[PDB]
Design a protein around this motif. Structure first.
Motif, PDB file in Angstrom:
ATOM      1  N   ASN A   1       0.806  -1.212   0.000  1.00 36.41           N
ATOM      2  CA  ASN A   1       0.000   0.000   0.000  1.00 36.41           C
ATOM      3  C   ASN A   1       0.840   1.263   0.000  1.00 36.41           C
ATOM      4  O   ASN A   1       0.297   2.351  -0.015  1.00 36.41           O
ATOM      5  CB  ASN A   1      -0.939   0.034   1.210  1.00 36.41           C
ATOM      6  N   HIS A   2       2.162   1.117   0.024  1.00 38.64           N
ATOM      7  CA  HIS A   2       3.062   2.257  -0.016  1.00 38.64           C
ATOM      8  C   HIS A   2       2.893   3.037  -1.327  1.00 38.64           C
ATOM      9  O   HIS A   2       2.686   2.438  -2.375  1.00 38.64           O
ATOM     10  CB  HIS A   2       4.503   1.774   0.097  1.00 38.64           C
ATOM     11  N   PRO A   3       2.976   4.378  -1.275  1.00 36.66           N
ATOM     12  CA  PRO A   3       2.873   5.179  -2.496  1.00 36.66           C
ATOM     13  C   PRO A   3       3.790   4.731  -3.633  1.00 36.66           C
ATOM     14  O   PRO A   3       3.383   4.733  -4.796  1.00 36.66           O
ATOM     15  CB  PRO A   3       3.277   6.574  -2.023  1.00 36.66           C
ATOM     16  N   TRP A   4       5.019   4.348  -3.311  1.00 35.97           N
ATOM     17  CA  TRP A   4       5.934   3.852  -4.337  1.00 35.97           C
ATOM     18  C   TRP A   4       5.409   2.608  -5.072  1.00 35.97           C
ATOM     19  O   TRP A   4       5.796   2.368  -6.203  1.00 35.97           O
ATOM     20  CB  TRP A   4       7.340   3.562  -3.777  1.00 35.97           C
ATOM     21  N   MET A   5       4.541   1.826  -4.438  1.00 36.62           N
ATOM     22  CA  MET A   5       4.090   0.560  -5.019  1.00 36.62           C
ATOM     23  C   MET A   5       2.831   0.663  -5.880  1.00 36.62           C
ATOM     24  O   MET A   5       2.330  -0.357  -6.370  1.00 36.62           O
ATOM     25  CB  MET A   5       3.878  -0.460  -3.900  1.00 36.62           C
ATOM     26  N   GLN A   6       2.323   1.877  -6.086  1.00 40.82           N
ATOM     27  CA  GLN A   6       1.096   2.049  -6.863  1.00 40.82           C
ATOM     28  C   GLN A   6       1.394   2.030  -8.366  1.00 40.82           C
ATOM     29  O   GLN A   6       2.516   2.314  -8.793  1.00 40.82           O
ATOM     30  CB  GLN A   6       0.355   3.326  -6.439  1.00 40.82           C
ATOM     31  N   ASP A   7       0.381   1.649  -9.146  1.00 45.00           N
ATOM     32  CA  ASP A   7       0.452   1.605 -10.613  1.00 45.00           C
ATOM     33  C   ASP A   7       1.534   0.658 -11.150  1.00 45.00           C
ATOM     34  O   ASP A   7       2.244   0.977 -12.094  1.00 45.00           O
ATOM     35  CB  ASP A   7       0.630   3.018 -11.198  1.00 45.00           C
ATOM     36  N   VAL A   8       1.635  -0.523 -10.561  1.00 46.36           N
ATOM     37  CA  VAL A   8       2.592  -1.520 -11.019  1.00 46.36           C
ATOM     38  C   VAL A   8       2.218  -2.026 -12.420  1.00 46.36           C
ATOM     39  O   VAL A   8       1.043  -2.131 -12.764  1.00 46.36           O
ATOM     40  CB  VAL A   8       2.685  -2.712 -10.024  1.00 46.36           C
ATOM     41  N   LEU A   9       3.231  -2.327 -13.221  1.00 45.33           N
ATOM     42  CA  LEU A   9       3.022  -2.954 -14.510  1.00 45.33           C
ATOM     43  C   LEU A   9       2.669  -4.433 -14.342  1.00 45.33           C
ATOM     44  O   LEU A   9       3.132  -5.098 -13.415  1.00 45.33           O
ATOM     45  CB  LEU A   9       4.281  -2.845 -15.370  1.00 45.33           C
ATOM     46  N   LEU A  10       1.850  -4.928 -15.261  1.00 46.54           N
ATOM     47  CA  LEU A  10       1.590  -6.350 -15.407  1.00 46.54           C
ATOM     48  C   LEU A  10       2.865  -7.046 -15.878  1.00 46.54           C
ATOM     49  O   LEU A  10       3.707  -6.412 -16.501  1.00 46.54           O
ATOM     50  CB  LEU A  10       0.490  -6.570 -16.447  1.00 46.54           C
ATOM     51  N   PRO A  11       3.035  -8.345 -15.557  1.00 44.85           N
ATOM     52  CA  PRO A  11       4.242  -9.032 -16.043  1.00 44.85           C
ATOM     53  C   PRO A  11       4.500  -8.879 -17.551  1.00 44.85           C
ATOM     54  O   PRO A  11       5.604  -8.494 -17.944  1.00 44.85           O
ATOM     55  CB  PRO A  11       3.980 -10.497 -15.663  1.00 44.85           C
ATOM     56  N   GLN A  12       3.490  -9.137 -18.383  1.00 42.61           N
ATOM     57  CA  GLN A  12       3.694  -9.128 -19.835  1.00 42.61           C
ATOM     58  C   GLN A  12       4.169  -7.774 -20.359  1.00 42.61           C
ATOM     59  O   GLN A  12       5.101  -7.722 -21.163  1.00 42.61           O
ATOM     60  CB  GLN A  12       2.433  -9.570 -20.591  1.00 42.61           C
ATOM     61  N   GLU A  13       3.549  -6.688 -19.896  1.00 47.22           N
ATOM     62  CA  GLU A  13       3.983  -5.355 -20.302  1.00 47.22           C
ATOM     63  C   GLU A  13       5.333  -4.967 -19.694  1.00 47.22           C
ATOM     64  O   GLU A  13       6.080  -4.200 -20.291  1.00 47.22           O
ATOM     65  CB  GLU A  13       2.902  -4.290 -20.050  1.00 47.22           C
ATOM     66  N   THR A  14       5.670  -5.524 -18.535  1.00 49.62           N
ATOM     67  CA  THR A  14       7.033  -5.387 -18.012  1.00 49.62           C
ATOM     68  C   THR A  14       8.041  -5.958 -19.021  1.00 49.62           C
ATOM     69  O   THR A  14       9.056  -5.333 -19.306  1.00 49.62           O
ATOM     70  CB  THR A  14       7.229  -6.100 -16.651  1.00 49.62           C
ATOM     71  N   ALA A  15       7.759  -7.146 -19.547  1.00 48.17           N
ATOM     72  CA  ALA A  15       8.661  -7.789 -20.498  1.00 48.17           C
ATOM     73  C   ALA A  15       8.749  -7.013 -21.812  1.00 48.17           C
ATOM     74  O   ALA A  15       9.838  -6.818 -22.350  1.00 48.17           O
ATOM     75  CB  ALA A  15       8.218  -9.208 -20.762  1.00 48.17           C
ATOM     76  N   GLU A  16       7.599  -6.575 -22.317  1.00 52.31           N
ATOM     77  CA  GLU A  16       7.533  -5.854 -23.590  1.00 52.31           C
ATOM     78  C   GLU A  16       8.377  -4.583 -23.535  1.00 52.31           C
ATOM     79  O   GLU A  16       9.151  -4.319 -24.449  1.00 52.31           O
ATOM     80  CB  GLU A  16       6.080  -5.511 -23.947  1.00 52.31           C
ATOM     81  N   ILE A  17       8.242  -3.827 -22.443  1.00 54.86           N
ATOM     82  CA  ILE A  17       8.961  -2.557 -22.268  1.00 54.86           C
ATOM     83  C   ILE A  17      10.432  -2.760 -21.924  1.00 54.86           C
ATOM     84  O   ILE A  17      11.292  -2.097 -22.505  1.00 54.86           O
ATOM     85  CB  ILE A  17       8.309  -1.658 -21.178  1.00 54.86           C
ATOM     86  N   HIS A  18      10.721  -3.680 -21.004  1.00 49.27           N
ATOM     87  CA  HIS A  18      12.061  -3.796 -20.431  1.00 49.27           C
ATOM     88  C   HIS A  18      12.873  -5.031 -20.779  1.00 49.27           C
ATOM     89  O   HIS A  18      14.087  -5.010 -20.595  1.00 49.27           O
ATOM     90  CB  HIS A  18      11.979  -3.747 -18.908  1.00 49.27           C
ATOM     91  N   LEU A  19      12.233  -6.111 -21.231  1.00 53.00           N
ATOM     92  CA  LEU A  19      12.947  -7.384 -21.401  1.00 53.00           C
ATOM     93  C   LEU A  19      13.048  -7.888 -22.849  1.00 53.00           C
ATOM     94  O   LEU A  19      14.021  -8.562 -23.187  1.00 53.00           O
ATOM     95  CB  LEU A  19      12.334  -8.456 -20.502  1.00 53.00           C
ATOM     96  N   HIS A  20      12.064  -7.570 -23.691  1.00 54.68           N
ATOM     97  CA  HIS A  20      12.117  -7.951 -25.106  1.00 54.68           C
ATOM     98  C   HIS A  20      12.991  -6.968 -25.870  1.00 54.68           C
ATOM     99  O   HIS A  20      14.083  -7.324 -26.300  1.00 54.68           O
ATOM    100  CB  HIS A  20      10.721  -8.003 -25.739  1.00 54.68           C
TER     101      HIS A  20
END
Length: 273
Positions: free
Chosen positions: A254-273
């Motif tokens: 619930n910490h402010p830093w933890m809000q609006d997390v990416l889904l796994p798949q879009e994490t990969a698309e943006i950062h891993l693929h």
């Protein structure tokens, strides 16, 4: 029989955990990891319902391997005269987080948020299953590079979760909390939260905050890289010297830093693929 049922591949590595090989299940070419550990080298033993003497890691893995989760699942195991062999899921392609951070350096906070968030859910899963991992660190986290999913490995230092004090610990020291360092005493959840603080710092700085016991118990957190105020705050919270001053998993998520997390798949698309 073990080796009629599994085609063994290269050694992936070895250490305190034993020796781990790539493999494939012949009946459907499912990718697996095959972990051999010698009985002599086994510290902790438990037992399955039917009273079979097994390593504790087997008990803990059976408990967390029901359902889908962010934990590498135990698919099967075998007893040999002088070893146990464990058959584990293997993501492909996969890279461990230590390797990943060593290679790429400090993570963008968006990526660290997605990763840290998935670790929290996996740790909540373990705890729901009555399992405390006790060695959460970058090396014990696999990244499925195509799905952007994190999976916890190595329950070889783990234990049954309990509400009374732990007076044993054979995990990684630099991820170990100051109450352990100075008292040889910790409670499970608050010690986990400490290790998570160490992990979050590692992710956004590219290296762990403390090397020596003296630094751990001082717990003064210096930032070597540019890190956001909200992230610094969560890290310093997780690394509170008094365990009772640390956040619960709920407070973390619930910490402010933890809000609006990416889904796994879009994490990969943006950062891993």
């Amino acid at each position: 029989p073990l080796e009629s049922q599994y085609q063994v591949g290269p050694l992936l590595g070895s250490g305190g955990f034993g020796s781990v090989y790539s493999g494939i299940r012949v009946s459907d070419n499912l990718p697996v990891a095959i972990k051999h550990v010698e009985k002599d080298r086994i510290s902790d033993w438990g037992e399955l319902p039917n009273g079979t003497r097994v390593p504790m890691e087997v008990v803990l893995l059976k408990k967390v391997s029901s359902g889908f989760s962010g934990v590498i699942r135990l698919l099967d195991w075998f007893e040999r005269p002088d070893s146990f062999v464990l058959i584990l899921e293997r993501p492909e392609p996969v890279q461990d987080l230590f390797d990943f951070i060593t290679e790429r350096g400090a993570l963008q906070e968006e990526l660290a948020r997605s990763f840290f968030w998935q670790v929290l859910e996996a740790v909540r899963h373990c705890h729901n299953c009555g399992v405390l991992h006790r060695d959460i660190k970058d090396e014990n986290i696999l990244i499925d590079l195509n799905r952007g999913e994190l999976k916890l490995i190595d329950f070889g230092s783990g234990a049954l979760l309990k509400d009374t004090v732990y007076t044993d610990f054979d995990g990684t020291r630099v991820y170990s909390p100051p109450e352990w360092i100075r008292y040889h005493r910790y409670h499970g959840r608050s010690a986990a939260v400490w290790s998570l603080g160490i992990l979050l710092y590692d992710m956004v700085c590219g290296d762990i905050p403390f090397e020596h016991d003296e630094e751990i118990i001082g717990g003064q957190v210096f930032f070597r890289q540019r890190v956001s105020s909200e992230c610094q705050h969560l890290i310093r919270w997780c690394l509170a010297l008094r365990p009772s001053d640390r956040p619960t998993f709920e407070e973390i998520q619930n910490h402010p830093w933890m809000q609006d997390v990416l889904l796994p798949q879009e994490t990969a698309e943006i950062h891993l693929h």
